[PDB]
Amino acid sequence: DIGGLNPCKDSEVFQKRLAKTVKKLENRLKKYEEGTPPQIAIQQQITQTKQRFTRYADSNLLCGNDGLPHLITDGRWSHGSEFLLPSILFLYISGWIGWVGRKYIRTVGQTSNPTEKEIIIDVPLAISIMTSGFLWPFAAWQEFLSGDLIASDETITTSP
Amino acid sequence: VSFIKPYRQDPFVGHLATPITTSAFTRAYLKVLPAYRPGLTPLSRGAEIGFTHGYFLIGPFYTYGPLRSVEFSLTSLAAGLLAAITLLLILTVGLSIYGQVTYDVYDNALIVKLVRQMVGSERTQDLPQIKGTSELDTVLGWQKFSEGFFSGGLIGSIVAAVGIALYSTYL
Amino acid sequence: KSTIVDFNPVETSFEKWAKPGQFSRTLAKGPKTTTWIWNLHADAHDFDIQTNSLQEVSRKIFSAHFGQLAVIFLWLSGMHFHGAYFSNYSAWLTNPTSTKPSAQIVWPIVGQEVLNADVGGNFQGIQITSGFFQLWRAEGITSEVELYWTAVGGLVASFLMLFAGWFHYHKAAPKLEWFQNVESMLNHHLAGLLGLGSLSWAGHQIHIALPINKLLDLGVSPEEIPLPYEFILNRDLIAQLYPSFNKGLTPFFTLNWGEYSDFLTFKGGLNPVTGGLWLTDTAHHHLAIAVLFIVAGHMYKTNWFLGHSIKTILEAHKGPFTGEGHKGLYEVLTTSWHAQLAINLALFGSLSIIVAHHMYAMPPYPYIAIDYPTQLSLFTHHVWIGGFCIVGGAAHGAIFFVRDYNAANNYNNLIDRVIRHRDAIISHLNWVCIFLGCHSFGLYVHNDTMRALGRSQDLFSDNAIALKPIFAQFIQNLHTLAPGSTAPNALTTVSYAFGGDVISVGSKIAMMPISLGTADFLVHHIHAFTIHVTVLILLKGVLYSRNSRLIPDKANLGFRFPCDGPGRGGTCQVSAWDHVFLGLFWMYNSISIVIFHFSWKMQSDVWGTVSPTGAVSHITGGNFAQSSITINGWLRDFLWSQAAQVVQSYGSSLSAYGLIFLGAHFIWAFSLMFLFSGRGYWQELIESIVWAHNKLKVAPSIQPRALSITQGRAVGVAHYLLGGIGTTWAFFLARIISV
Amino acid sequence: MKDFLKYLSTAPVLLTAWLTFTAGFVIEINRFYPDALTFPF
Amino acid sequence: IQKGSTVRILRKESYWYNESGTVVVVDQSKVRYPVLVRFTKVNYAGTNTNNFGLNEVEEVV
Amino acid sequence: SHTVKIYDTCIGCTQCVRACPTDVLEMVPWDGCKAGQIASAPRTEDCVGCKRCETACPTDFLSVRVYLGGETTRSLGLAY
Amino acid sequence: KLKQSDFPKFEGSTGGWLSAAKNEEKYVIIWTSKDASLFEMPTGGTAKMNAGNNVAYFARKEQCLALGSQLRGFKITNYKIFRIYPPLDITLLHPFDGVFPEKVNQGRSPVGKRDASIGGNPNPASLKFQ
Ligand code: CLA
Ligand code: CLA
Ligand code: CLA
Ligand code: CLA
Ligand SMILES: CC1=C(C/C=C(\C)CCC[C@H](C)CCC[C@H](C)CCCC(C)C)C(=O)c2ccccc2C1=O
Ligand code: SF4
Ligand code: SF4
Ligand code: SF4
């Protein structure tokens, strides 16, 4: 399909990889005894390996000639769960972190001892700001509009 | 008693009078060496130094060279002798250039007194200054020293080769 | 109102916990730049600059020692708890030669359960190379319940040491005169601590370890072995194994000590069953050590008209060559903690290295000689600790010279006379270092270039120009002849390394004569050269810590400063700290070469298997003798060859070793950013980053500053050491566990 | 418990607690839903 | 400008260039740099105050 | 020999002069500051370039500046 | 024992002057002390002052000035440093006008003073080929 890849559900090398891993795990399982915790752990390993391979097969995942899932990150929504949705999730979380950090910096920057409140965090104010970051996309595009997001010329510059 | 004292009663020199720097054994041993033995012209000092140095220099080249022989070989001896002679030539070249760039004097132990008495209002470093009063510290003295080193090195290397051949053959 | 302690000196309060940097006069005002944060941790334990009173520094040091001992006890309790709960110690007891010791199981997350290896005995976990199983077996511990109780005792002891530290800083802090009783302290540490510890351990060995281990070696399973207390209440369970307890303590009090030859032997060699030292020999050794140390503890005058005064001993040791001699040394060592730390750390690291040598040389634990990973790990770890401690001793000697050295109090004594001719010492040490390096390494390079030029007869090899270590071979011959000639009451040599028979346990070689040839000559001279260069750097740091021809007032700049400026052609790293930094680098080099020599020589010419007919086959096959004489040989037949197991560990239970190999490479390369660069570039880059932050109104109030020059060097050296030591750690462990 | 709570509000203790909590919920997500290469939806 | 006034630093070779500081005292003598300004941010040397000329400071509204 | 320049931002706090290890700087009368004194560099032939002088300078970007130049046995700090 | 009676009671160190302070220049520091205090040499170790005139020779001006700075801790202030060329060419150096450089003395002219701040320095491109 895309880039010459093929779905992993029809990739023979993918099933060969699964079979080889299961065979190695079973051979390891053979050298232990009865329902002893080592055998239980190896059986859990086998079950998890089978579940992971089955989930990857039924996941709209494209496999190359090596039988490994390749990620299609050109931007198409068909393979949108590989990069685009995790990209949105990370952008949300990281914007949350950056927004709460910036808000805390600007909030304790207007107190008597701004530097003290950076090594000794005001946990009440920190908790107040941190749970308010869920609106960071909206807060950012409400502070940029008001001109409160960017400094203009009070920023310092070197000699040249 | 204390066997370490300031050198020549000067506590500010970067030196000490230890039982090695200023011991009677050290005094006599260094005064019998060719570099400091009294009554030797610079040519004689160079000749003796070259003889000793070639004599002990042929050894390592002949014994451990690229053409060794557990038995006695004339080729091994010739190789060691040639290597020793060429090393002496390199050392003589170094001596010559060092003397060329170091001194500008032809008769020392006088110029110092002349400029300490008759004034030295010149470009200095030749009239004034002048480090050391030995005859080895002149352009003429160092030239003869290098000449003696070179000739004595050749002679001592040849003598040591002859001795090595005699020892390996008749013993 | 005791005469030794002050009651309730410091109030137990949490107020100062909320004021970081309260100890320092400069840091107490609060952070203004990020340099304050780093300065906070760099001055935490520098008690000299926190108080102007030696008494307060001594009390802080005493409580810090208590905290450290509590940490050590907690670590030991954790080790025993892991042995009790997450180990296969019981299975290893019944099959020491076929079960690999494991005492750490790994949770099944993110696929990391592959690290649980097939260590044997129906167990999965990480193979343990600390030798705790062998130590516990030598202690007579035959059950995991005993390990649990030892862990509980360790926890109780750790709490006790924590309470002791709190008590002796906040409730009853000793006075300076108590700390300065060096005669009493030496008497107690020599008699009580050392001698009585040896005596108590000899008692434990004789009454618990001797019978239990004898029964274990006889084939008695641990379940039918009597509980250890039964060997004390019943004089018949121990009198069957050692038929001399039937006479009781009467032979001891009647001076008929020959009767106790049953369990106090002098045999030498190794136990043929376990491959370790005879535990009867060990018990006799500890008894003799106890008596010797108890006797040695009655030397210094403490509270009666009896004993020696260290001041009078030192002041009487003058000489024609040494002026006032040791006059003033007692005042130096009783008023400066840094001098004591220097001496103790140097001798402590040297002792650690000696311990490392004597460990593999004479394996003291049952079934530890045939556990090659344990032997390799123990040697390498102890040598590393020794090198670090020696560098620390040099560092604290330099610190004493900078800070606690008084010129007036040391007029014409040994310290003064050493400083007065420091030039001669350093110049001759420089010449010796150049001579040793030229010779050792250039002989290596000559071998390499002769081999590369196809001239095999021109090498410094055994089949070529040969440099036989005749002096060491003479000593080896003297030791193998000692039993019956110079040690007439010995039955076997102290170690089979000096010569004798091949000792094998379960077809695995425990010890064997270590032959010394031209390959050992070169590597030993490499060791000497590296040690000499490290000594050169550290001694130059100590001697030139106060002044020099460059900076005549270097003592006024302190122990830790980056430079004096770009003048004088450049005055970088003139400190004494910058000498402990370079010396750390050279110690890493020396110890790395030492452990490489040990690993290759043991794998190639000691360790291996013995055929039933007596044929010895080694791990590598004797390639050390002919291929360790060239740098290409070290690169190929050792590094490249034995790195195969590390690089091929992916997908196996040793994959963690490959991951740590790669990560240690990454950290070592990361160090070079700090080691090669300078502070100005990073400060000017932080300037633009701060511009961006200010543009987005997110510049922190604590102004971000690049790490100071000294801190940049410290970070670089710490990362370099961590990366190199971790790379060698992963390489050694993967290689010696795979094969 | 006025200065102890202030000590717990210091940067190292707060960072250690936050990173321990963060690693905790990450590890537990990866335990309950392991081997997640793509978005579950 | 006077004591307590807020000024912007116009000296280019300044750790507080384009930044705002508080005037501590303006000297009335014939000194070259009479204006003394205190800042909240310490410079690279650790100081937080400096003397500025009359043309190197601009009062904030 | 190195070059040392003094700038009128000098406040005459004398910290440069009392930090010079080779007696290069000295305090001379002036009328450009409250202290009535300014640093001078009349003995730059002894300047070693250690830059202790400008490490003790409290003015914003320094009032004493050391420009390294030609080297001399005095400026190289050679006791030999 | 020593060449001169005013030398400090120093046992000599291999850190003193070398052949340079015999053909290029040597520095001598003189001072008078009330007590025979024990002080640390800038070169080596501990020396003992004389209860009176003290004279010490060094290879560098910095060594003499470090010794003088140490002397200030002994409440010694009258120390004076001289430069001696290969012959007896004595030149007073440190108390040049009899007043220490840290104290303002009349009769001193500013040397190396620029009537502008750092920002007034000319651009290097305009200082090319001169
Ligand atoms: C939490 C606040 C915060 C915010 C909003 C930003 C924002 C920014 N940083 Mg930044 N930074 C921060 C903290 C922050 N940083 C910290 C703590 C450090 C020290 C490690 C840095 C080091 C740094 C460098 C070296 C660079 C930036 C750069 C940037 C810019 C591009 C984004 C980027 O590369 O991220 C960079 C982010 C990191 C390197 C990791 C930050 C470390 C953690 C995640 C942040 C700290 C969280 C904090 C403790 C939360 C506490 C708040 C709570 C008490 C309420 C952007 C202006 C770049 C730039 O200038 O581009 C224009 C750049 O080169 N930053
Ligand atoms: C026979 C008596 C005796 C014994 C056994 C010890 C033992 C010890 N002393 Mg010690 N000491 C003694 C007498 C004694 N001292 C006297 C008389 C003085 C006064 C001059 C000192 C002054 C002194 C200082 C200043 C320091 C020590 C330190 C140490 C420890 C060294 C660390 C070590 O080797 O770890 C081995 C550890 C163990 C074997 C663990 C078990 C040891 C336990 C704690 C028994 C300790 C015995 C104790 C003195 C009994 C007092 C109990 C109390 C209720 C009165 C060690 C525990 C150092 C240390 O670490 O500080 C804590 C230290 O800095 N001692
Ligand atoms: C008994 C051992 C001992 C003791 C008591 C001390 C005590 C002291 N040393 Mg010292 N030192 C030692 C051993 C010791 N050292 C050794 C072995 C070395 C050689 C490396 C040194 C080298 C040394 C130098 C070079 C200096 C000191 C200094 C000091 C003083 C301040 C220490 C401080 O505040 O650090 C606080 C503690 C820290 C900053 C911890 C830093 C963290 C380390 C560097 C990294 C550890 C990594 C660890 C192994 C885990 C890595 C694993 C990774 C995967 C994460 C103090 C008196 C300093 C001083 O000014 O003395 C007056 C100083 O300049 N020491
Ligand atoms: C492979 C890299 C390398 C090498 C070769 C050296 C070599 C040396 N270091 Mg070291 N060093 C290194 C890395 C290295 N270092 C690193 C990374 C650091 C950073 C921490 C240091 C830090 C350091 C310090 C701090 C010190 C040294 C010192 C020394 C010298 C010890 C004396 C000696 O053996 O001289 C003999 C020279 C050699 C063994 C080099 C090879 C010479 C060959 C084998 C023989 C001669 C070849 C011949 C002349 C070639 C002629 C032909 C040619 C003209 C074409 C020596 C020059 C010490 C010193 O100054 O010397 C006493 C010292 O104090 N080093
Ligand atoms: C990068 C660099 C800096 C800048 C480095 C800085 C500012 C350090 C920043 C450290 C951050 C802010 C905290 C550490 C973050 C790590 C992720 C934590 C360590 C990892 C743990 C597992 C220990 C210098 O200041 C410097 C100074 C002198 C020589 C070389 C250099 C140099 O190379
Ligand atoms: S900064 Fe680096 S180079 Fe410049 S002086 Fe200090 S150390 Fe020497
Ligand atoms: S460099 Fe700076 S400090 Fe050193 S002398 Fe010249 S001016 Fe005085
Ligand atoms: S340094 Fe700047 S401020 Fe300090 S004295 Fe010299 S000139 Fe005046």
XYZ file of C-alpha atoms in Angstrom, chain C residues 24 113 169 199 207 233 285 310 344 353 409 517 543 713 715 731:
16
model
C 26.572 29.158 55.021
C 10.960 -9.525 32.736
C 24.392 16.346 68.017
C 37.802 -12.386 68.999
C 31.082 -22.478 67.563
C 24.032 -26.009 74.360
C 43.824 -16.438 62.059
C 52.445 10.094 70.825
C 43.036 7.517 56.685
C 43.431 -2.746 46.938
C 53.791 25.850 64.148
C 56.635 -14.049 31.737
C 53.097 20.588 47.568
C 35.293 20.520 35.559
C 30.673 17.602 36.181
C 31.630 -5.370 29.660
